[PDB]
């Protein structure tokens, strides 16, 4: 473990979410029909065990349209991240987009600190 | 103190439009979905349509034509109307509020002068105690969307559990959700004369949330 792959891999983390928003933020209103858990609490890297768990039906969402392989990619990640916690979601859900920015904004919090 | 409050007009001519109104306080239609959901005299459950937090609208194919959901954020109301009305449409009327951990209003009763999701017994027929498994399974995946209900006559549903395994507050422990991906159960253990009801799986993983047809319990 340390710092330097540790802040690398959060910028990756956070770059491949911007690439998914982007490639939607560009069969939209399907999309939005979906709706995604969110965390009730989300401050360190443990709580990426809420990102992980709604991984595949974010790939299932986002299959209505590369993929496999940027989740795949993204799953990676949060794995090391969140290394070796029960996430605790929130009762409000979120569309895919306000459920990709509450996570980029997740991120974008963990780096300027580091 | 979430509440919701349906008001409806009691009776209708079958030549004239349905409306409802929606009232709900302890909550933020900028922050939740509603839906609408209505249940014929001795008849299933059936969902009608959701107004989305962001204002849009999705429909049961059904009924699309001639239906149209609206809110008023900064009046905290929602309004159903319904055109080109049947008898068939009597009806309780029921809005929802659909995050996570649904919150059902009361329901008033309008007298007229896709995933599909099949559900285990239509009828069980237990003695008392005993252990009993209702099934509700999927046409896919459905990534734990899915809520156990329980009604009893003259009354609206009873949240159970949602998401599939979470236990809902102030519901006993003999009540138990589990499953993955496409199929899921309720497990009633030692089962109690408080537990004679019709319990109903919904499914809300995309549009329409459909409900399974109903299992009636009885002891017998």
């Known amino acids: 473990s340390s710092t330097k792959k540790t802040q690398l891999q959060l910028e990756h983390l956070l770059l491949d979410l911007q690439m998914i928003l982007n490639g939607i933020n560009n069969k939209l209103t399907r999309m939005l029909t979906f709706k995604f858990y969110m965390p009730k609490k989300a401050t360190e890297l443990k709580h990426l065990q809420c990102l992980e768990e709604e991984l595949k039906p974010l790939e299932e969402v986002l299959n209505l349209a590369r993929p496999r392989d940027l989740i795949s990619n993204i799953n990676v990640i949060v794995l090391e991240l969140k290394g070796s916690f029960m996430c605790e979601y929130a009762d409000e859900t979120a569309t895919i987009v306000e459920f990709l920015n509450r996570w980029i904004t997740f991120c974008q919090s963990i780096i300027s600190t580091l | 103190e979430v509440q919701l409050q349906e008001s409806g007009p009691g009776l209708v001519a079958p030549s004239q439009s349905l409306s409802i109104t929606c009232t709900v306080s302890?909550?933020?239609?900028?922050?939740?979905?509603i839906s609408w959901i209505r249940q014929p005299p001795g008849k299933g459950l059936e969902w009608l349509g959701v107004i989305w937090t962001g204002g849009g609208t999705n429909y049961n194919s059904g009924f699309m034509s001639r239906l149209s959901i609206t809110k008023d954020n900064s009046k905290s109301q929602v309004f159903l109307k319904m055109n080109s009305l049947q008898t068939d449409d009597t009806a309780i009327y029921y809005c929802?509020?659909?995050?996570?951990?649904?919150?059902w209003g009361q329901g008033t009763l309008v007298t007229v002068s896709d995933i599909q999701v099949t559900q285990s017994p239509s009828s069980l027929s237990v003695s008392l105690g005993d252990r009993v498994t209702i099934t509700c399974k999927a046409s896919?995946?459905?990534?734990?969307?899915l809520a156990w209900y329980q009604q009893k006559p003259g009354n609206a549903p009873r949240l159970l559990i949602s998401?599939?395994?979470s236990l809902e507050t102030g519901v006993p422990s003999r009540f138990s959700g589990s499953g993955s991906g496409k199929d899921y159960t309720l497990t009633i253990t030692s089962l109690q004369t408080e537990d004679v009801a019709t319990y109903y799986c919904?499914?809300?993983?995309?549009?329409?949330?459909?409900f399974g047809g109903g299992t009636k319990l009885e002891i017998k």
């Open positions: 919904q499914q809300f993983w995309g549009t329409p949330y459909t």
């Open positions: 302890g909550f933020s239609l900028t922050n939740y979905d």
């Open positions: 929802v509020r659909q995050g996570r951990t649904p919150y």
């Open positions: 998401g599939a395994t």
């Open positions: 896919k995946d459905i990534y734990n969307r």
